[PDB]
């Protein structure tokens, strides 16, 4: 009904049984509508999970397009990698479903590695606005894999262990990077 | 007789006709071995990009018990990164049509995660052995994901650009990292 | 229920009146469509009958396309065989007791042979990509020659007696030819 | 020999200009007849191609009846396909002509289901008679069907290269099936 | 086993692929034979059109051996002109496409001439035998001459214009100099 | 040096020797001419013996189209026939000669047919030209052809008996096909 | 009254006592004759193993001469070859004691040379029958000889593994001489 | 003093009169030597035509153990059979009359079944040496004994038929087995 | 196995690119040695395809040497010529791509021609060992060139098709030359 | 005394300095004629020595087109071979005692493998002609290489022994693969 709906009992689906045993239309049938209307938000099962991303991706290339010219770039990379990863306990608890889903299962890493790139697309663009032009030079694009790094670390140890908030996690792998490997 | 020999005629016959259009007895034949032979070292089409891995993880192993403990921890990653894809002048052509297939092909990426996990399982267990045990704790950990990550920003930037070494794209790639984001 | 609700309705007044009486207004107008609607879904009246068969070959080719390479061939053929006739008691009155239009009318036959063509195609490939050069070459058009008899066979049986399962008749059929002629 | 002097002289006419430019009296014509007296011999133009057929199957009755009991019943069906289907370098060419119209020419295609199934009833029925059972049990008709698919196999094997031997085509698609697909 | 067999084959490969392109192995193949049997019927690939035209003089010498001696030299002749060249309704088709090839070939005109000689000899000695005798006489050698000439018209007439009965055409031609030219 | 004194020279040298067996060069040589120098007067050894045919057709050509209208066929025929053949006792001989070479060599026919074809031409425009038009219409091709017969004829007597005029034979031959065959 | 039914008996005490252990009495007294009685029907112990060969011989004749002409040379010769060489289980176990006494006793080679040259006779005739005719020529002969020597393979090898079928074992034998050593 | 020189002799003996009419001391005294020392070489009157067959065997095993690994196993074959059939005037005829005596006689067929199984063993060891080696297996055996009547249909065509040569009898017997009945 | 190593990768460079367009250094560095290491190996890049060559004919004559001399000079000639052309599936691969290069290449003919001149040497000697005379009399010498013959036609034949068996080709092809054109 | 002057001077001077020291305009120089003449016969260097060997072809091809069709296939090629080596003592200087440039000169010999191709497809079009289907089949091309062996075999004879006939020679090599290597 809303993209957002759809996905979201999708992934109650696919958390209960496997991702590979649940069909499209198990989704539409849950989600309360015919088959092709999910098609009208989802070209593909494999989209499901990753929800409204574009929004997502949209919203961060917004934030760091706005951040302050005289805000450090390490300080706008934390800032923003926290902002878009905080949750209400409510919301908490499907994204660790969703994370699960999209982490864990073989089938949607082709889908996912072009999401994935579609986020270092948008921490490139960050830092070559900041510095000289071209997202694919190997600075902005270093930086971009860098934090796509921090983040599943961060993700991965959010999940290993349920007592970890996800923001401390981002802010502490963030921080190993931020201070330096020659530094511990 | 040789895993090696096998994965080397795969990536040619990859590199020439793509992924999805060469067949696992197009393999074998261009091989010189039965179908069955070739399932004693693959279990799978995807498997065959990434030839004997687990040894090249061994190896690597081998490298990072042998460094002296007097030597910092930043330069054993960093001497490691560079060695363990460091290619006799025979490899480089065939390495560089190798990383097209694994970095570029769809189907090749839930299996390439599988690789990239044991890789950050090798730097995760040599980190937590100079600092605090505990493979699965934050930071040997992060210290992997960034790694990995500095390592695929290398390998895109030799693979977009022939004129780059690709030990000085993992070398450049590992120093800001290193460094660290706090300066620039 | 749009192509099928068409193919249904057809099979009604075919199998209710000649098949060369029933015009296709009668079946537009039997299924409450127009007639250049109709034209959307089927080129033709003779196409009627064969429902969505494009689909039926691009299911079976998917499911032969993505069966386990090591998986032998026999296992392959007798799975793809069976996937694809299970139907539920509704579905399959639509097919049993009652005689097959696709079968039984003598203006079918010439078109017919060109939609077993299409069939034999798909096995034929499927043979030749596990085996040998070309899909013209004998043993995979002997093959799909081969599986089409077990077919025709297995659909004869089950439509002369109603108390069989189609299912068991090709499973049955196919173990004839797997077994072989040498062990009668 | 009337019949088949007909059926010849027709066959070099559908060769050399259409089967459907080619009218009955082109072939009462050109076989030195009256329009009337080839309806003695023939009911319809579609049947002239098939030549006598009713003879055809009284010869198959007469070899199967007169192979000895002793001979094993795959000996048997293989001698009787090869022995069926033999003839002059001559008899071949006209032959080939005949085999083209009956396969390829979409009015034939009725009439030829009616001449297999005649066919398959000679076969069926010399099963039967060698195993027990009825002609219309599945194992009898699988063997008739598959033996059908053995033969149009062959047949287009042999025209579509025509360096081929006719019983070698025939003897080699027979032996995939008595060997059986659990081996090739 | 027949001269005439291997004629009627060479002249339908000689009117698809002319006659210089044309083989004697193509010949023999046609016509169902090893190659010296084709040897013995004829010496030479330029023969193979004439057929079995000493058997033709033969009977065109039976012909005028029982026309009664009371029946008109000029009747007879004309009466022998048109049944030497009348054929059934069977070969009146291949008539046209052999004399095609044997008036309008090059390399055929050598031994047509001798042919010609042929016919004219049976022609002047029936002459001879009903005027005073000497086969080389002048006259019973002119109205040979004369005779050949109107045949070949009429034959070129034919050819030219498919809609020319060739009796009519060979009398017609026969009637002018029959007349004589003294008449218009 | 003149086209005639080559063709003279060349019918001496086929006379004594083959026709077979001389070749260009012996005309060249005997002519004392350069090979190339009898290539601008004659394409062909075969169109050596045809003197300068082209010449006499042009002459009675213009003979026969100068011919007063009111002068009969036949007489114009006749007149035209037994001026173009008239000779001294010198030429007489050499004309013997050139057409036995003609007549009676193999290699010469198909050479000689086009000749024959160019002759008949002009009888066949001449009775066009005072008939109906068209030089291909039956009655003007077949005065050709009997024209063509009664000159072979002729030619023929002329060499198997040689105390004949050549124009006396010409007129014989010409007479019966002038009064006609329905009188002897 | 049978022939076969004194070889039968004949060959049951060859396989439990030795062949040459066995005398003409024992095997007399065993199928319920007199002594000259056996000799009407064998005359000498030798033939004995080789029952009704004669019979075997012009069956296996009358077979292959009504083998129709389309059916082609290799298909007859293995049909007719595995058609004599079919018996139901009871009929193996008395084959299997026939051919251990007639391939392994020397005393009996003499004698079966005899009957193998009968048999390859049979198949040489056959052969010019439907080649050119005469019995004695090179191929026809060659094919007999080759014919014996895939079933004397075939034979042996069924004796030697308990695990084969005797028609499978002749057809493997046949099909490595008809396919060919390439 | 030589095996093959009485068993020469022998031959000379047996081709001129029967092999049965032909006794031992006959043999001794037209070879030079004692009745007992004709004793030492052979045991009996049926090992006096197959000569010095232990000798033959040993240089064709020696000839087939020999041959390159890279040489296919027909052309191998092939060459062997007819290297030691390859004779020159003088010693055709000699093998003429010891053939026919060999192959005519029933007398010697016991003895002559012993000589074939030897040759036999050699063909199969050679084929186990190259293929799976258990020399009573199915296939080096079958084609032992195809090698055995392709061998025995030569001999016995160049006997009955003067004009033909030996070597090009076994090449032709030869090559209807390598090729194949089809 | 140094010089053979390095002519495998030569080939296969040569088989990917040009030859033209590969260099002596890129083989040395396909081969892992120094550009001085090569040269102890090969006098030039021309005899690099060739291999070791030298030891091929040494080894053709050990095999000529070993055959036993009781062995027909024919049967000796055959087997030398199908065992010196033998190898796995994988070893046939590398040779198909390397007689590509040696029949193809116009560079390699004048030395190509050197090496036909050695192998040619070897069956000239070995003729003449077991015939007498010397090894420059005419037999020995046309066998040698016949036997080049039959060799290179096979080689082509099996470059061309690529279902064909090297030593069926060779055989075959000595065959006709064996039984001799007196024959086929 | 055009193109072959030029070849003459051409092989005197490469006879007299190395083909490679010979330049065309030196050739143009020493046979009287501009630079450009030459190239209206030659197109190259490399033509030079091969003469008019199109002419030679088209020669040989309307020999082997025109030989009877009853001679026997050896018969012809033995024919033909030593038809066109049959010269004067002085053509025979420009040929033997002396060795050959074409043979001989390593710069020729990718150029003169191309000229042998000629040769061998004239003969192997003249065998698939009398005997089979296509001029690539093994059988023609076997034959055209043999034939090919026999004549350089031949050459190489004349040349190593100034007393031989080269005929002779031919005829001997021939003779050899005639009888076959079956008979040595």
Same mark, same amino acid.
């Given at each position: 009904?809303?993209?957002?709906?759809? +996905?979201?009992?999708?992934?109650?689906?696919?958390?209960?049984?496997?991702?590979?045993?649940? +069909?499209?239309?198990?989704?539409? %049938?849950?989600?309360?509508?015919?088959?092709?209307?999910?098609?009208?938000? $989802?070209? +593909?099962?494999?989209?499901?999970?990753?929800?409204?991303? +574009?929004?997502?991706?949209?919203?961060?290339?917004?934030?760091?397009?706005?951040?302050? @010219?005289?805000?450090?770039?390490?300080?706008?990379?934390?800032?923003?990698?926290?902002?878009?990863?905080?949750?209400?306990? @409510? !919301? &908490?608890?499907?994204?660790?479903? *969703?994370? *699960?889903?999209?982490?864990?299962?073989? !089938?949607?890493?082709? $889908?996912?590695? &072009?999401? $994935?790139?579609?986020? %270092?697309?948008?921490?490139?663009?960050?830092?070559?606005? *900041? @510095?000289?032009?071209?997202?694919?030079?190997?600075?902005?694009? &270093?930086?971009?894999? &860098?934090?796509?790094?921090?983040?599943?670390?961060?993700? !991965?140890?959010?999940?290993?262990? !349920? @007592?970890?908030?996800?923001?401390?996690?981002?802010?502490?792998?963030?921080?190993?990077?931020?201070?330096?490997?020659?530094?511990?």
């Amino acid at each position: 009904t809303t993209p957002h709906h759809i +996905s979201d009992v999708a992934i109650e689906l696919f958390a209960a049984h496997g991702f590979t045993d649940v +069909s499209v239309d198990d989704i539409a %049938r849950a989600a309360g509508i015919a088959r092709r209307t999910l098609f009208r938000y $989802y070209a +593909s099962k494999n989209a499901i999970p990753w929800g409204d991303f +574009s929004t997502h991706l949209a919203q961060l290339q917004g934030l760091l397009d706005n951040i302050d @010219s005289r805000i450090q770039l390490r300080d706008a990379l934390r800032a923003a990698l926290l902002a878009f990863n905080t949750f209400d306990e @409510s !919301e &908490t608890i499907r994204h660790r479903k *969703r994370m *699960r889903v999209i982490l864990q299962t073989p !089938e949607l890493q082709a $889908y996912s590695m &072009t999401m $994935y790139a579609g986020w %270092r697309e948008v921490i490139a663009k960050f830092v070559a606005r *900041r @510095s000289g032009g071209k997202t694919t030079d190997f600075m902005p694009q &270093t930086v971009a894999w &860098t934090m796509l790094g921090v983040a599943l670390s961060a993700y !991965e140890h959010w999940l290993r262990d !349920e @007592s970890v908030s996800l923001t401390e996690a981002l802010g502490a792998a963030f921080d190993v990077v931020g201070a330096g490997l020659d530094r511990l």
